[PDB]
Amino acid sequence: GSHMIVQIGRREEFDKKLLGEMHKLRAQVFKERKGWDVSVIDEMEIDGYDALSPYYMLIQEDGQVFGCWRILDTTGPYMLKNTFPELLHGKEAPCSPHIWELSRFAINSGQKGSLGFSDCTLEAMRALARYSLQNDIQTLVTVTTVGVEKMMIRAGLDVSRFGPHLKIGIERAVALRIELNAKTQIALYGGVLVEQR
């Protein structure tokens, strides 16, 4: 009713309408960014990875998607391995059921973002790291910018890079590994996450 709702699930679990607002948000963010292998179809940023069984995280507020993130198994194709392999610096692309890739961070930038943005991200990572840890994941990898990298090294996460950042489009982009260990967990939650069964 005025609070934040976060959903995390497989593409198939979300209503064609929510998906359409997610991809519109990604278009509002990524439209005509060059170098990020973007395709906008009918005002929606959607690509072949979306047809590979991704998970999505959506943050909502007053009935609208304000932020979204995509998650891909590293046992299948993912953007670091198959779109941005230069950022690997010749290292091997991870491939494991315990590691996932994040991509397509998109946050509505307008007036109606009622939480902030340093934090919007915080909240997303809290929900994301937990969903991942409960699905036996130890590591998140992603291609993002140097900006988000520092935002994350500052928030305390344990974050390391595969190699030097590179100019992608108008950005300085880098491939990160985000360990979901104790240090991350404590940064995110104030301590070690404990799940009950």
Which residues of this chain interact with Zn ion, rule CB under 5 A? Answer: 1-3
Considering the complex, what minimum distance in angstroms separates the CB of residue 85 from Zn ion? 42
Considering the complex, what minimum distance in angstroms separates the CB of residue 112 from Zn ion? 14
Among candidate residues 47, 127, 59, the one with its CA nearest the CA of residue 84: 47
Contact 172, 164 (CB under 8 A): no
Considering the complex, what minimum distance in angstroms separates the CB of residue 108 from Zn ion? 17
Kindly state the helix (H) or strand (E) to which residue 2 belongs, with its residue range: none
Q: Which is nearer to Zn ion, 64 or 96 (CB)?
A: 64
Q: Which is nearer to Zn ion, 47 or 61 (CB)?
A: 61
Considering the complex, what minimum distance in angstroms separates the CB of residue 3 from Zn ion? 3
Q: Which is nearer to Zn ion, 43 or 62 (CB)?
A: 62
Q: What stretches of the chain adopt beta strand conformation (E)? A: 5-10, 40-41, 44-45, 55-61, 64-73, 99-107, 139-145, 158-161, 166-168, 171-179
Q: Which is nearer to Zn ion, 43 or 119 (CB)?
A: 119
The amino acid at residue 192 is V
